[PDB]
């Protein structure tokens, strides 16, 4: 109390003041923009939702004693807000109760009164007209309530709060979404409640119970129209079915719901991660690595974020399933130190023709390979141990004797050198050909890639994308 207790009065009141006026001006601003000029995609909806991912998770973790978040429940226990006097009565109460919680002690939430902080705030004439207010101020008290992590009769405090909030969401979904479309708000609300309800089903039994309900929310999605609702629920529905290590992937191959068609640069980024995971395991290697490449370069705007460490981890494997390998560890992180040492020393052995070192890597770093969800490399990367050099030779040489290629690939027999090169050309490693008469493996024709109509194909791709930006820009620019 003389050391830290004197610096206990400054942390409540300024987050009680100006952080309160954030959602007070936003929730006032989002409501009036839901009333008039209802197409508010170009408004404060997005960045406030970018804040609720980032800011309010690190603005507060505990329920903020001396009445900053512990005071939110005696603040919003009494909200009528129904008619224009009932709002202006409560606008006086927004002045009164915030002043009382800024001065003195209201109902102090000592981590236990959460269900009477879900009835009586929802009671005392709380509206479904302010269903964004009930939607936000039920999803935001998940975050002091989960991140306490004491988990002692709080799992049901999670469970009741989500079912209250989603029954409010269902009551929106059937009754009068008059020019509002709370799906923009309630998508990440459906996500954030079910990131941790997934975590609840990590501490306890399996989470196909989530997936049956998540089909039902996706069944009521896609029927109205798609405005990010199908997009957010699809990545959620895919994740457990990929997280389970059963068969599980032909369900996604038949999942013909491939189109969100616009995803605000962030759903589309990790959507391409999960479908790249799928196309890699069913041996469609070349299409997988190029959409893994598209996923890697789409959201790098982060700070050592860890899933960037994951997409970078898979992409080097699938290109080691194609022979080529780039520089990888040139952007070393405080966490990449753990993940560079296996895979750089892995491809060190892949480029060489060594195998007793390669099996030494497997015994050294099998636990991390099993932890990363990549058991399958040992059955599929031993293929490209011979396919790396034969692509390297057919890139270097032009007309090789197959007798000479056996010692150069240390194949220890000249007669099966027909068969590997037959496997290379039938699968399309190199466009070369064999003369089965005196040992020739001769290469392609002369390079003719300017006067043979091929520059027109790439030039048509760049027309069809660049002026497509032009037409999409002119429509999107002039709203007034």
């Amino acid at each position: 109390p003389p050391g830290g207790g004197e610096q206990e009065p400054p942390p409540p009141p300024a987050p009680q003041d100006v952080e309160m006026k954030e959602e007070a001006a936003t929730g006032g601003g989002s409501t009036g923009e839901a009333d008039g000029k209802t197409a508010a995609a170009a408004a404060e909806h997005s960045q406030r939702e970018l804040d609720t991912v980032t800011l309010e998770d690190i603005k507060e973790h505990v329920k903020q004693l001396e009445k900053a978040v512990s005071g939110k429940e005696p603040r919003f226990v009494l909200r009528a807000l129904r008619m224009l006097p009932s709002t202006s009565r409560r606008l006086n109460h927004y002045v009164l109760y915030k002043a009382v919680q800024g001065f003195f002690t209201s109902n102090n939430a000592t981590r236990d009164f959460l269900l009477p902080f879900l009835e009586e705030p929802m009671d005392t004439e709380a509206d479904l007209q302010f269903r964004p207010r009930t939607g936000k101020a039920a999803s935001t008290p998940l975050l002091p309530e989960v991140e306490a992590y004491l988990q002692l009769l709080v799992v049901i405090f999670m469970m009741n709060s989500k079912r209250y909030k989603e029954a409010q969401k269902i009551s929106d979904d059937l009754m009068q979404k008059i020019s509002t479309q709370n799906r923009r708000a309630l998508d990440l609300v459906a996500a954030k409640c079910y990131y941790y309800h997934a975590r609840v089903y990590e501490f306890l039994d399996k989470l196909d119970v989530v997936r049956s309900f998540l089909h039902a929310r996706l069944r009521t999605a896609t029927l109205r129209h798609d405005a990010d609702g199908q997009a957010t629920l699809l990545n959620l529905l895919l994740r457990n079915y990929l997280h389970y290590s059963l068969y599980d992937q032909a369900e996604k191959l038949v999942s013909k719901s491939v189109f969100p068609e616009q995803a605000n640069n962030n759903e589309w980024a990790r959507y391409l991660y999960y479908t790249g995971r799928i196309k890699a395991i069913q041996l469609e290697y070349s299409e997988a690595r190029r959409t893994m490449t598209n996923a890697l370069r789409k959201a790098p705007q982060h700070t050592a974020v860890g899933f960037k460490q994951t997409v970078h981890k898979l992409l080097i494997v699938v290109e080691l399933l194609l022979g080529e390998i780039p520089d990888r560890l040139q952007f070393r992180q405080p966490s990449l130190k753990r993940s560079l040492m296996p895979y750089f020393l892995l491809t060190q052995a892949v480029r060489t023709g060594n195998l007793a070192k390669f099996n030494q890597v497997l015994d050294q770093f099998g636990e991390k390979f099993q932890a990363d969800g990549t058991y399958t490399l040992i059955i599929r990367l031993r293929h490209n141990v011979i396919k790396t050099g034969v692509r390297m030779i057919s890139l270097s040489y032009s007309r090789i004797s197959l007798a000479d290629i056996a010692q150069k690939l240390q194949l220890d027999s000249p007669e099966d050198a027909e068969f590997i090169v037959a496997k290379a050309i039938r699968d399309g490693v190199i466009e070369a050909s064999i003369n089965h008469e005196k040992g020739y493996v001769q290469s392609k024709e002369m390079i003719d890639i300017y006067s043979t109509r091929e520059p027109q194909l790439a030039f048509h791709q760049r027309i069809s994308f660049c002026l497509d930006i032009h037409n999409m820009s002119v429509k999107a620019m002039r709203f007034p």
């Binding site: 031993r382 011979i386 396919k387």
Partner: protein
């Protein structure tokens, strides 16, 4: 009820009459109640021991009788019974070779994409033990790099029954790949190239490809015809579609005024 558990299976199974009685046994079990909810109830897991066992013996009968669509029919429902949601389920010791029947079968019909996505369900039985699952994945490893001959040499080593209905189709769908490599326009080889590339010093198989395909042994010489294309190209003949392709350029510049 409790109908003919080991009647004509443990000694010998040449019969189709008990196959019709197993059909009647399928009528008795799938009219008991159901298998869909599986909430709790070890007492209704009691016939789930029975229902899986009688489809194990239906799977053994299916591969014994040389039947392709029905073997995958019973095996899918067996896999549906290892798709049990509430799986207390003490281990029926026939499971691993039962999967190895399916894992080898689905390799044989060239479902290689389905081959590797099935392998996800086993935590450590692929490597630590279980030669029944270790045999197809070591086999599929031999198909990867260059190793045709080790497949044909390690045919004669099976821990289980001989897997004969799988492996003969499995080798036959290797022979056509060697054929489809050697059916090119590369014109003539001799009978010793048939022994090296195709296989088999003097077989009935050289009579097989003499009557199926050509490859007739003339004056100690096989004649494979030219499989070479003609390539009739002008490639200015994309002139209409190229003139078309220019039009939607100027269209999409204009027309939105």
């Amino acid at each position: 009820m409790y109908e003919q558990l080991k009647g004509e299976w443990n000694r010998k199974s040449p019969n189709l009459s008990k196959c019709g009685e197993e059909l009647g046994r399928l009528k008795l079990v799938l009219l008991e109640l159901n298998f869909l909810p599986t909430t709790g109830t070890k007492l209704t897991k009691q016939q789930l021991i029975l229902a899986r066992d009688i489809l194990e013996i239906g799977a053994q009968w299916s591969i014994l009788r040389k039947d392709i669509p029905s073997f995958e029919r019973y095996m899918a429902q067996l896999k549906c019974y290892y798709f049990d949601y509430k799986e207390q389920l003490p281990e029926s010791a026939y499971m691993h070779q039962l999967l190895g029947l399916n894992l080898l079968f689905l390799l044989s019909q060239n479902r290689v994409a389905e081959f590797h996505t099935e392998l996800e369900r086993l935590p450590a039985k692929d490597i630590q033990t279980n030669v029944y699952i270790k045999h197809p994945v070591s086999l599929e490893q031999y198909l990867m790099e260059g190793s045709y001959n080790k497949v044909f040499l390690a045919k004669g080593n099976i821990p289980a029954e001989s897997y004969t209905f799988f492996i003969d189709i499995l080798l036959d769908t290797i022979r056509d790949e060697i054929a489809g490599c050697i059916e090119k326009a590369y014109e003539k080889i001799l009978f010793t190239e048939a022994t090296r590339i195709l296989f088999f010093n003097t077989p009935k198989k050289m009579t097989d490809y003499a009557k199926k395909r050509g490859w007739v042994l003339g004056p100690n010489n096989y004649y494979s015809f030219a499989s070479q294309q003609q390539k009739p190209e002008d490639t200015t003949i994309p002139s209409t579609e190229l003139a078309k392709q220019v039009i939607e350029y100027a269209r999409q510049l204009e027309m939105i005024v």
